[PDB]
Amino acid sequence: TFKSEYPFEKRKAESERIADRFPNRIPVICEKAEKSDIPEIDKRKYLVPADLTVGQFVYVIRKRIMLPPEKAIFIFVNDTLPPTAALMSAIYQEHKDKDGFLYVTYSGENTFG
Amino acid sequence: TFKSEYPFEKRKAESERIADRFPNRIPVICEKAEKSDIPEIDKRKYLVPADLTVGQFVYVIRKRIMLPPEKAIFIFVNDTLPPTAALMSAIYQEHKDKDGFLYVTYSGENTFG
Amino acid sequence: MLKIADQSVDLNLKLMKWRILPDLNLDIIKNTKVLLLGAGTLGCYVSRALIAWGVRKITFVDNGTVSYSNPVRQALYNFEDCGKPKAELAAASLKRIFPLMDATGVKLSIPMIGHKLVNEEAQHKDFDRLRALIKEHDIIFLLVDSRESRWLPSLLSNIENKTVINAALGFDSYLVMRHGNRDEQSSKQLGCYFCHDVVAPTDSLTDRTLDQMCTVTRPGVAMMASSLAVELMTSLLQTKYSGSETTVLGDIPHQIRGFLHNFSILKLETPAYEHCPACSPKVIEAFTDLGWEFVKKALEHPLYLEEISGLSVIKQEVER
Amino acid sequence: MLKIADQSVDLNLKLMKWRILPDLNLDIIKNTKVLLLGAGTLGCYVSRALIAWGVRKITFVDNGTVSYSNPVRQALYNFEDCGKPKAELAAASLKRIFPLMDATGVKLSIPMIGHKLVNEEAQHKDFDRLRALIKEHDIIFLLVDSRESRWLPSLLSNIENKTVINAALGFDSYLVMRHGNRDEQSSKQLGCYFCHDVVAPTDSLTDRTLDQMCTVTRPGVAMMASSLAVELMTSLLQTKYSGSETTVLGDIPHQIRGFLHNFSILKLETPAYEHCPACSPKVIEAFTDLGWEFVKKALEHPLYLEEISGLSVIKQEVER
Ligand SMILES: [Zn+2]
Ligand SMILES: [Zn+2]
């Protein structure tokens, strides 16, 4: 995990160094759920634009991660499913970690019956 | 509920007025769980001695509340079941509310199969 | 003996109202006509929880047959049942449990979006058949086993203004949620199963291989999702209290997601997403205007659905 | 067809190991001999979750008969079964599901503490009968329906060093917990069902009236408690990881308490209480020395048990 390899100081730093530099981007750390059964890539750090919606951010995730369109996913932000039509800026203001980053988790959606 | 009829100031006050007066007692507020199916009495306020164990405190509850010995109960302290052999003082130090009082809840134990 | 049996079951139910929750409405539950889309592991456990709650009318919809590995996981079938049609066998099994049950089984195939239509008329009849079943029942439980299979039922239920309880299983987790329904007086609609991603459901089975994904699950998820789905329904059927989202039976969460590895359960809520390939107003308008003529196009061309819902508009937007 | 059926079920299990959790030990689960004390609502759902997990040897212990209201809530019985002995009927029902099951039913009465002994020798035979069954099995599920009925089984299981999974239901809640077992090398023992209060179990049935308490419950609690009890067992049977209280299947909570009104689940833990009327070392020592001669006295005189465990010492202490 990102936090599992970086202390609060070093993490709270890059956050500010990212805000001071790109006051239009959002420091997001997106990684797959622990017990989820879907693809993932080393890219966990993302600097998305505030006006971009959760849905739009989801597209990047599945694209960048090379996930097929036949399989769906859902994302968690502090054990909560954010509205798909919400602005990443709005989400960042309500769930940002004290370290400056917005931690997001994604997992495959349930489909069996 | 006790909190539902008294603000933090008035509650944080009697707590200190109780500590300054009886530094040997423990301000405990014991009331029955919301959806539990067992007896209860208007006496929700208790000032038990620190050396008294959870078990001993439980005896008072069921006695004072007039509960029959054939039925068992369990108590919650911050959604946790405290050790029966623990000192009320030890429990008060780990779960006391910022208002000075140790809030306890009791309910009938489950027995059906 | 049927009479005495009926009284004994009825008394068990009456006692929870008479001595535990006097405000409990047992009648509304008893008279609820339930449509179960899927007679697999979830369908079997849900139906059992439902009869225990006093529900008398349950209709199973499944076109499969009892497989050899089914019995140990699907609680209404026995080894001797292998090879026989599930839907009817399921209805028959409920009556063996409680003979007064009005249980029916319909071997119907739910047209799947993303799959090539093989027999236009035959699948047009399936569509109308499905819509009619949905229309005659009160609560629709969506207990199918693919993402695609949940699309058509979701749309039709929304169209027919029926409450839908959707349950889905993962290997170690599960989801239980009630789809929102559109209301003119309120500008607050709850999301549906499709409001959480940005891709139109499509064929996820035909191309599937063990490499794509295995379908096995820990036995416990089915029992948990099923019991919670039914408890959600019984509570939701109760009159909620004036200033809260609670009833005599407790909360009425929009969505519930549980996990076995850490024995946890999360209560969540999400609003209806305007670009949802299932509940978007644009998709509803398309159906209201063209009916089957529109559906047939979405079924064979999922990408078309994205054009209609607006999912293409937001992707193209980010595309630039 | 039995062979192909066996292979199909086995493959379903093998796939969760081969493609999802390679470290999963299916064999330990398969070879676990399970003793189910109680063939009521919990006994029926637990057994179903167990067979789905591959368990082959399950023994039901119940002395009752199928009642008219039982079928809708106890998932192994049908209307036609009414009046017949439960234990044997339950074993027969499991075999109807999966014929290779080594399912047995024993119509045994568990001597209850606080109740007058009616036939010394007859109940001495019951005691030895119970201890023997406990001794031959690996996991004991305590699924009885009274506080008293859980006492003797708890003591004997501790004595025979067997893992016990205790499940109990309330109208809107449930408890699932694994009793601690005594270990010489470790001075850390988990509590048991009796470690949470300070009164010796006693007769709670004979004097009971509707006024005392109704026994009806929301259908959902039984399915949830049962699935969680089995999932706890399968995880607990796995080798835990070096520096944690986790296995390949996840956590191994000591105690789990769930509630339907707010769809919540709490994971809790408690240490063995020295004055416990069930697991107190003094009670264990009494049994080790006098065996049945001691038990017979506790059974008719619960207050004596309190004298032995030390519950009187702490009450008398506060009494002054
Ligand atoms: Zn939607
Ligand atoms: Zn104990």
Side-chain angles (χ1 to χ4, degrees), chain A residues 2-3 7-8 11 13-14 16-19 21-24 26-36 38-43 46 48-50 52-62 65-92 94-97 99-113, chain B residues 2-3 7-8 11 13-14 16-19 21-24 26-36 38-43 46 48-50 52-62 65-92 94-97 99-113, chain C residues 2 4-115 117 119-120 122-124 126-183 189-207 209-210 213-284 286-288 290-295 297-312 314-315 317, chain D residues 2 4-115 117 119-120 122-124 126-183 189-207 209-210 213-284 286-288 290-295 297-312 314-315 317:
Chain A
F2 181 74
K3 282 188 176 182
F8 187 101
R11 298 195 282 84
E14 213 169 309
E16 311 177 309
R17 96 90 171 303
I18 286 176
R21 191 162 301 166
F22 327 77
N24 58 296
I26 299 173
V28 183
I29 296 164
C30 179
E31 47 219 317
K32 96 159 188 173
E34 200 178 7
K35 298 290 182 304
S36 188
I38 62 179
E40 66 179 305
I41 302 182
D42 294 302
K43 194 177 195 302
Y46 295 66
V48 327
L52 196 69
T53 65
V54 187
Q56 294 181 284
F57 171 63
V58 173
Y59 178 55
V60 182
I61 304 182
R62 44 188 307 131
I65 300 175
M66 242 64 258
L67 180 73
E70 313 74 48
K71 301 182 185 182
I73 62 183
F74 65 100
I75 59 178
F76 270 146
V77 174
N78 287 317
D79 287 342
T80 299
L81 263 85
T84 307
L87 298 177
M88 288 304 272
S89 62
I91 299 303
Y92 180 93
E94 197 196 311
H95 306 77
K96 60 173 177 299
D97 186 300
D99 84 325
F101 293 72
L102 171 58
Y103 291 68
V104 171
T105 280
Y106 70 78
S107 37
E109 182 57 282
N110 299 319
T111 65
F112 310 148
Chain B
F2 181 74
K3 282 188 176 182
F8 187 101
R11 298 195 282 84
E14 213 169 309
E16 311 177 309
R17 96 90 171 303
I18 286 176
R21 191 162 301 166
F22 327 77
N24 58 296
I26 299 173
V28 183
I29 296 164
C30 179
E31 47 219 317
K32 96 159 188 173
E34 200 178 7
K35 298 290 182 304
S36 188
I38 62 179
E40 66 179 305
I41 302 182
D42 294 302
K43 194 177 195 302
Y46 295 66
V48 327
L52 196 69
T53 65
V54 187
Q56 294 181 284
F57 171 63
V58 173
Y59 178 55
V60 182
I61 304 182
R62 44 188 307 131
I65 300 175
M66 242 64 258
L67 180 73
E70 313 74 48
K71 301 182 185 182
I73 62 183
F74 65 100
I75 59 178
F76 270 146
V77 174
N78 287 317
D79 287 342
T80 299
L81 263 85
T84 307
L87 298 177
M88 288 304 272
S89 62
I91 299 303
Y92 180 93
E94 197 196 311
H95 306 77
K96 60 173 177 299
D97 186 300
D99 84 325
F101 293 72
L102 171 58
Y103 291 68
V104 171
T105 280
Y106 70 78
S107 37
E109 182 57 282
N110 299 319
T111 65
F112 310 148
Chain C
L2 237 67
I4 194 75
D6 182 51
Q7 279 178 50
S8 197
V9 168
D10 189 56
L11 174 62
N12 169 281
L13 285 160
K14 290 290 165 55
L15 288 167
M16 24 191 306
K17 173 182 176 57
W18 299 346
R19 257 139 200 301
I20 314 179
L21 306 173
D23 288 345
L24 182 57
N25 186 337
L26 294 164
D27 288 342
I28 190 72
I29 294 170
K30 176 183 201 300
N31 302 317
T32 301
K33 302 195 216 309
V34 179
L35 181 58
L36 301 183
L37 303 177
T41 191
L42 287 178
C44 291
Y45 281 130
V46 167
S47 69
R48 280 181 173 285
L50 286 167
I51 66 175
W53 256 112
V55 175
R56 249 73 177 312
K57 211 266 199 297
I58 299 174
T59 301
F60 292 95
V61 173
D62 196 302
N63 78 304
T65 67
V66 187
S67 147
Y68 285 119
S69 66
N70 285 174
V72 299
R73 285 179 176 264
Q74 320 202 329
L76 250 23
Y77 314 127
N78 290 305
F79 168 88
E80 82 213 12
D81 294 335
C82 295
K84 303 162 190 176
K86 309 179 84 159
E88 296 186 305
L89 205 162
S93 191
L94 289 194
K95 294 185 183 177
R96 281 211 305 286
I97 295 169
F98 194 40
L100 292 189
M101 286 299 299
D102 177 6
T104 304
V106 183
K107 190 169 181 174
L108 172 62
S109 203
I110 299 170
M112 295 176 273
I113 180 167
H115 295 249
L117 293 172
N119 193 311
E120 159 74 7
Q123 295 181 295
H124 184 170
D126 284 344
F127 167 93
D128 274 68
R129 221 322 199 194
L130 178 58
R131 187 176 186 180
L133 284 166
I134 286 181
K135 188 179 175 64
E136 72 165 303
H137 291 76
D138 304 315
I139 304 280
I140 315 303
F141 276 89
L142 194 41
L143 315 171
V144 295
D145 64 315
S146 75
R147 173 176 174 69
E148 314 93 272
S149 289
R150 289 184 167 71
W151 184 73
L152 224 206
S154 298
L155 179 53
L156 293 172
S157 296
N158 191 339
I159 291 293
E160 292 300 327
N161 296 301
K162 302 297 189 176
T163 294
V164 171
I165 296 184
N166 198 331
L169 307 175
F171 169 81
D172 175 276
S173 57
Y174 55 88
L175 158 71
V176 171
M177 68 178 292
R178 53 192 184 98
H179 289 178
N181 283 93
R182 49 215 171 74
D183 174 19
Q189 187 177 310
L190 296 172
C192 80
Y193 178 85
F194 295 100
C195 291
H196 311 138
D197 198 331
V198 294
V199 289
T202 177
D203 193 349
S204 67
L205 307 181
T206 302
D207 96 301
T209 61
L210 248 181
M213 58 173 54
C214 195
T215 185
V216 300
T217 64
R218 294 176 57 165
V221 299
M223 207 169 299
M224 301 190 241
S226 296
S227 52
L228 294 176
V230 172
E231 290 304 319
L232 211 206
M233 179 201 84
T234 61
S235 190
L236 188 63
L237 283 175
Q238 302 304 304
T239 58
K240 82 174 195 61
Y241 295 148
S242 291
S244 64
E245 294 301 294
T246 65
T247 77
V248 59
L249 250 26
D251 300 337
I252 49 180
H254 161 51
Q255 172 174 173
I256 298 168
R257 290 180 180 272
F259 315 78
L260 276 55
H261 75 275
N262 68 343
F263 300 87
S264 61
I265 298 183
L266 304 175
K267 289 194 295 178
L268 318 150
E269 187 180 300
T270 60
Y273 177 53
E274 65 176 303
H275 301 314
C276 175
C279 72
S280 167
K282 282 101 71 182
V283 179
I284 295 300
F287 182 101
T288 302
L290 279 51
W292 174 248
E293 287 307 308
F294 152 72
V295 174
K297 293 177 185 180
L299 288 179
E300 284 187 313
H301 303 272
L303 298 173
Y304 176 48
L305 217 193
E306 289 197 36
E307 291 290 347
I308 297 301
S309 84
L311 282 180
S312 294
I314 65 86
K315 297 183 181 185
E317 178 181 301
Chain D
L2 237 67
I4 194 75
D6 182 51
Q7 279 178 50
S8 197
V9 168
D10 189 56
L11 174 62
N12 169 281
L13 285 160
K14 290 290 165 55
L15 288 167
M16 24 191 306
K17 173 182 176 57
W18 299 346
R19 257 139 200 301
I20 314 179
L21 306 173
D23 288 345
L24 182 57
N25 186 337
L26 294 164
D27 288 342
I28 190 72
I29 294 170
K30 176 183 201 300
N31 302 317
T32 301
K33 302 195 216 309
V34 179
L35 181 58
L36 301 183
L37 303 177
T41 191
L42 287 178
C44 291
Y45 281 130
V46 167
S47 69
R48 280 181 173 285
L50 286 167
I51 66 175
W53 256 112
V55 175
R56 249 73 177 312
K57 211 266 199 297
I58 299 174
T59 301
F60 292 95
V61 173
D62 196 302
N63 78 304
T65 67
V66 187
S67 147
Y68 285 119
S69 66
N70 285 174
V72 299
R73 285 179 176 264
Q74 320 202 329
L76 250 23
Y77 314 127
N78 290 305
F79 168 88
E80 82 213 12
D81 294 335
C82 295
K84 303 162 190 176
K86 309 179 84 159
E88 296 186 305
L89 205 162
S93 191
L94 289 194
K95 294 185 183 177
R96 281 211 305 286
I97 295 169
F98 194 40
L100 292 189
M101 286 299 299
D102 177 6
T104 304
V106 183
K107 190 169 181 174
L108 172 62
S109 203
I110 299 170
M112 295 176 273
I113 180 167
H115 295 249
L117 293 172
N119 193 311
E120 159 74 7
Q123 295 181 295
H124 184 170
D126 284 344
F127 167 93
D128 274 68
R129 221 322 199 194
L130 178 58
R131 187 176 186 180
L133 284 166
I134 286 181
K135 188 179 175 64
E136 72 165 303
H137 291 76
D138 304 315
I139 304 280
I140 315 303
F141 276 89
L142 194 41
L143 315 171
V144 295
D145 64 315
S146 75
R147 173 176 174 69
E148 314 93 272
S149 289
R150 289 184 167 71
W151 184 73
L152 224 206
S154 298
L155 179 53
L156 293 172
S157 296
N158 191 339
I159 291 293
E160 292 300 327
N161 296 301
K162 302 297 189 176
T163 294
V164 171
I165 296 184
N166 198 331
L169 307 175
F171 169 81
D172 175 276
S173 57
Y174 55 88
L175 158 71
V176 171
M177 68 178 292
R178 53 192 184 98
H179 289 178
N181 283 93
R182 49 215 171 74
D183 174 19
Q189 187 177 310
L190 296 172
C192 80
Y193 178 85
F194 295 100
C195 291
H196 311 138
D197 198 331
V198 294
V199 289
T202 177
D203 193 349
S204 67
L205 307 181
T206 302
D207 96 301
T209 61
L210 248 181
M213 58 173 54
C214 195
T215 185
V216 300
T217 64
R218 294 176 57 165
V221 299
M223 207 169 299
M224 301 190 241
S226 296
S227 52
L228 294 176
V230 172
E231 290 304 319
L232 211 206
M233 179 201 84
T234 61
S235 190
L236 188 63
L237 283 175
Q238 302 304 304
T239 58
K240 82 174 195 61
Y241 295 148
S242 291
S244 64
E245 294 301 294
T246 65
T247 77
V248 59
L249 250 26
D251 300 337
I252 49 180
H254 161 51
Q255 172 174 173
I256 298 168
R257 290 180 180 272
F259 315 78
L260 276 55
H261 75 275
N262 68 343
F263 300 87
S264 61
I265 298 183
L266 304 175
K267 289 194 295 178
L268 318 150
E269 187 180 300
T270 60
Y273 177 53
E274 65 176 303
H275 301 314
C276 175
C279 72
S280 167
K282 282 101 71 182
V283 179
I284 295 300
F287 182 101
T288 302
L290 279 51
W292 174 248
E293 287 307 308
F294 152 72
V295 174
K297 293 177 185 180
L299 288 179
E300 284 187 313
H301 303 272
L303 298 173
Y304 176 48
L305 217 193
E306 289 197 36
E307 291 290 347
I308 297 301
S309 84
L311 282 180
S312 294
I314 65 86
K315 297 183 181 185
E317 178 181 301

